[PDB]
Design a protein that fits this description.
This is part of a larger assembly, with three copies of chain A. By secondary structure, the first copy, chain A, is of the alpha+beta class. Chain A has helices at 9-28, 53-58, 65-84, 89-105, 113-134, 141-151, 156-169, 234-241, 257-267, 283-296, 340-354, 362-374, 387-410, 418-421, 424-428, 435-447, 450-458, 463-472, 498-515, and strands spanning 4-8, 38-40, 48-50, 174-179, 186-190, 193-195, 213-215, 218-223, 247-251, 273-277, 300-301, 319-326, 331-336, 377-382, 412-414, 477-480, 485-488, 495-497, 518-524. In chain A, strands 6, 7, 8, 9, 10, 11, 12 and 13 form an eight-stranded mixed beta sheet that branches. Chain A has a three-stranded mixed beta sheet with strand order 4-14-5, with helices on both faces. In chain A, 48% of the residues lie in helices and 17% in strands. In chain A, helix 11 (340-354) packs antiparallel against helix 12. Chain A has 19 helices and 19 strands. The relative contact order of chain A is 0.19. Chains in contact: A-B, A-C. At the A-B interface, strand 1, helix 3, helix 11, helix 19 and strand 19 of A face helix 1, strand 2, helix 9 and helix 13 of B. Strand 19 of chain A pairs parallel with strand 2 of chain B, so a sheet runs across the interface. Bound molecules: adenosine-5'-triphosphate (2 copies), potassium ion (2 copies) and magnesium ion (2 copies). It is classed as chaperone. The entry lists the keywords mitochondrial, C7-symmetry, chaperone. ATP-bound human mitochondrial Hsp60-Hsp10 bullet complex (C7).
């Protein structure tokens, strides 16, 4: 209903291209090992310093609405590349700018831009097939460290710590990046089963040094219900006292009367016992209690289906652990004595539940729970001096984690834009259906040299000469922009994940070739 | 109430024609196989790229209120054409602009524009009769694929997938378009009775690979009331246990004591049973449960009228399914053992209820029930790399389904604007009553060349020469604007639904010939 | 580079191939081919080339010594 302004043809296309060019010019200065950073003003507090392409793209919106349409479309390109790959957003931005520019240049009266877009998509399918032919799988941890080093802007300590994390918790294990309070990066490996619920009352401490509850070879009592009565807690304590064995009660809550009994027996006679709340929220509580029961070889009490009561407790429905550590804010069970076969069947149940979930929230819960059963999790604390430096480093650590996961998934290709340069002869063998598809294939052929050219231009050299020498060279040779030398790139560890490259190219090509079919732009009149 | 500006005669008509011309110029760039796209800025997020004429029309409003009146009238033309036919909105827009322009040019002191409008409508009736004479019914699935391909801007894959859907679920079956998460379009055929209610308890899972409940040759217990007591659930379980047969309960809800009994008997002794909530939200829920009762051969318990009781359940009161899958979010019943004549009677009851339906929302529910009872539904998932591409493609897929349904309903004619071109000799034989009616007939006669001329102009050639060559050629010969050649259009599959053509012409003609009768325009003074 | 740029090709690649070529080989920008320039008659007067270089170098290298610019305030 609002009044609109309608622009036609080449003027509207040039305004949208101005928006695309401004955003991609801001993004392109961050590409490669000699890329620079972008400072983005925040409404609150300190500005943000970043080398991340989608972060730069998302922070830019233009007053002119025709320019802002092109800026929003390349924002979509960078966001989609970040969503499905976690890396390569700058490459996708510069590819999208190249395709938009070449498509806008090739529009005349006789051109059919929809068929040009068909030719563009056919060329991208050919390039993706050639990239999959060129890809090789990751086999060594050295390749892992090289991928993580390249994706972290040449930082070898980040690559080494990510490779160590994947050596310790597995290549598909749970790795989590968070803030460090020190100057240096730290890797913490959380083994066993550790959850973020501490002890319930501050009267179960037997070790002064950490103000912590310390037991070894202890019974574990699992409860899906709150333990508030005498009759629901006394027989388990009788079993624990008749065996001279410590007891760890993991329940929904132990409050009031059972808590009073526990603290009275702990303080007066010296009964070894501790009470921890049940981690989780809702069905995750029941799932994690069940998993602790399989891992310790115990049984969950007070449940919906089997309905085991806390009055008839046996010595065989209490789990056994080799060590338990309880602190103020967390607890951890170590060396659970559960049946190993039941642990493997529960793990397979977790994997088959992963295979049918797609909400990306309970998927992370299932990954957490699988990691707790199998090998533990890894936490990378990112060190630094200030919050701005820590955040800038965490962007690259997240990029390197995502790229390493991608390289474990789909393999590796040559870095430095060389993998798209070696796909040009695949395009040279295509037979286009008509002239418009030939135009589209040639657009993609010219666009394939753009990442290597941008990396070389950011290094202060003539990018066209670098790309020409790479093309004239043997297939293993490419430009090391950091060293400024033509090297064997696999031997020097300058490699990229295949999935990142194909994702960036496909995401750029679809949106940019849709944009180049436009003839009329309708905007709202700014009030 | 507010202050008004009043304009008279030719100046007001010129301003209204400026509004009409602006909207039609924006819409007309999208017409034909060489049409281009329009980018519409959205208030939120990404802009919308479209080739749909009514979408372009509805997005344009003008600050000048005199121009905005003409813009809203051609918006009405496009919206009415989309509501009746679902396609041909660009054709309707350009026809309306042509009629408005010719009628505005033919207004003098002695002219009677109301009688000119009467001549216009008489000419349109003659053209519609000639179109119905020229129409031929659709007999082959090849014609289905050709219609869907033409309506989807030459996309042969969309035509093939729509033809496959109409092969599998019928030409009058239920076909729904939704988003795909992949690159490519997918066709999913849902057969039998599948509804979006999963299991009530996770403990019913007996197949871990899909985390789902799988049963073969199972009893079905259907209740219109909630099952919550022991006595309402025990006898059916006793019948299921005595017959050595799985039980599937479909109820309003299963909670409380009955759910506890179900999960206890499932976990302890391994009783084959599963409980599912009933689909629907009222009378539709009762109708769907009744439909499942006829489909499986069972009876609905706890209904309002017959009032069957869950205490006295007979084995013949339970339906029989050959197979059933219950997942987390859906359930599906396969090979029900209901009486075929009862299923037929229910089907005719549903068809006659459709015949007496006047809401178009209950029509969807009745068609869904008919599809679940007879042939199943088809889901077209539209693929793409981004939301803007997916939305642009879904516009064309929806257009192709609407055009294919229209072609099934009322037949086909020559595409490319040639069907209206061949109706000119029908206008050449009319005898007008007076000079004003002769003017109106001649307006329609000039207007009948506009769609072919616009299609040829978008292809970059001289439209008038193309139209003259078509009119001088044989009746089967038209212009392939994609190939740029004069061809046999039926043989080349360039065809249109007759309903779309006549709807576009009638909807354009009524509004534009009403608009050309205006002498005074009253607008509000802009505040 | 400027002659190659005006011909619609990439000037740096052209200059690189000329510098990698034999001393008689240069780029016919009208035909878009690497040719023998004396045989094809693409030749220049020596005086014109040296005059253009000297007259550009003197003024431009004097201009690049400037720290302060004084202009009149526009009325
Ligand atoms: N020493 C190097 N020599 C040549 N190319 C290199 C070198 N180090 C990294 N590269 C290349 O630089 C690219 C990485 O650039 P950068 O990380 O700045 O952008 P991106 O991955 O496209 O985007 P973003 O990280 O912002 O999401 C990859 O193609 C990588 O192979
Ligand atoms: N190859 C072709 N040669 C000639 N005419 C063609 C060809 N393909 C399609 N057409 C014609 O183009 C017209 C379809 O144009 P288009 O779908 O852009 O507009 P529309 O149906 O009027 O409106 P909308 O789809 O926006 O609601 C039909 O008349 C169809 O017969
Ligand atoms: K970057
Ligand atoms: K159209
Ligand atoms: Mg990167
Ligand atoms: Mg159409």
């Amino acid at each position: 209903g609002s009044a609109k302004d309608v622009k036609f043809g080449a003027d509207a296309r040039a305004l949208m291209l101005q928006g695309v060019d401004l955003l991609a010019d801001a993004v392109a200065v961050t590409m490669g090992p000699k890329g620079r950073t972008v400072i983005i003003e925040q409404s609150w507090g300190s500005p943000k310093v970043t080398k991340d392409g989608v972060t730069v793209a998302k922070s830019i919106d233009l007053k002119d609405k025709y320019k802002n349409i092109g800026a929003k479309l390349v924002q979509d390109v960078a966001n989609n590349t970040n969503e499905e790959a976690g890396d390569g957003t700058t490459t996708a931005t510069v590819l999208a700018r190249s395709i938009a520019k070449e498509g806008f240049e090739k529009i005349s009266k006789g051109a059919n831009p929809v068929e040009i877009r068909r030719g563009v998509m056919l060329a991208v399918d050919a390039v993706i097939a050639e990239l999959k032919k060129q890809s090789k799988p990751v086999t060594t941890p050295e390749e892992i460290a090289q991928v993580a080093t390249i994706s972290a802007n040449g930082d070898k300590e980040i690559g080494n710590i990510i490779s160590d994390a994947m050596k310790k918790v597995g290549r598909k294990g749970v790795i989590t990046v968070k803030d460090g309070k020190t100057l240096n990066d730290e890797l913490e490996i959380i083994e066993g089963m550790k959850f973020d619920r501490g002890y319930i009352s501050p009267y179960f401490i037997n070790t002064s040094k950490g103000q912590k509850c310390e037991f070894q070879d202890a019974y574990v009592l699992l409860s899906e219900k709150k333990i508030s009565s005498i009759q629901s807690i006394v027989p388990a304590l009788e079993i624990a006292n008749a065996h001279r064995k410590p007891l760890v009660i993991i329940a929904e809550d132990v409050d009031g009367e059972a808590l009073s009994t526990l603290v009275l027996n702990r303080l007066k006679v010296g009964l070894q016992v501790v009470a921890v709340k049940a981690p989780g929220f809702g069905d995750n509580r029941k799932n994690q209690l069940k998993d602790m029961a399989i891992a310790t070889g115990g049984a969950v009490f007070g449940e919906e289906g089997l309905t085991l009561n806390l009055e008839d407790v046996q010595p065989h429905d209490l789990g056994k652990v080799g060590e338990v550590i309880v602190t103020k804010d967390d607890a951890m069970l170590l060396k659970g004595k559960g049946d190993k076969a039941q642990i493997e069947k529960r793990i397979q149940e977790i994997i088959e539940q992963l295979d049918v979930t797609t909400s990306e929230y309970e998927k992370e819960k299932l990954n957490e729970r699988l990691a707790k059963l199998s090998d533990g999790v890894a936490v990378l604390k990112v060190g630094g001096t200030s919050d701005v430096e820590v955040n800038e480093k965490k962007d690259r650590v997240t990029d390197a984690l995502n790229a390493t996961r991608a390289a474990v998934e789909e393999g590796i290709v040559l870095g430095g834009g060389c993998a798209l340069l070696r796909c040009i002869p695949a395009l040279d063998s295509l037979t286009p259906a008509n002239e418009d598809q030939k135009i589209g294939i040639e657009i993609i052929k010219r666009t394939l040299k753009i990442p290597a050219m941008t990396i070389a231009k950011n290094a202060g050299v003539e990018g066209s000469l670098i790309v020409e020498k790479i093309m004239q060279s043997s297939s293993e040779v490419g430009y090391d922009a950091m060293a400024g030398d033509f090297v064997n790139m696999v031997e020097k560890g300058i490699i990229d994940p295949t999935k990142v490259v194909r994702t960036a190219l496909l995401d750029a090509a679809g949106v940019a070739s849709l944009l180049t079919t436009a003839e009329v732009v309708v905007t709202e009149i700014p009030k």
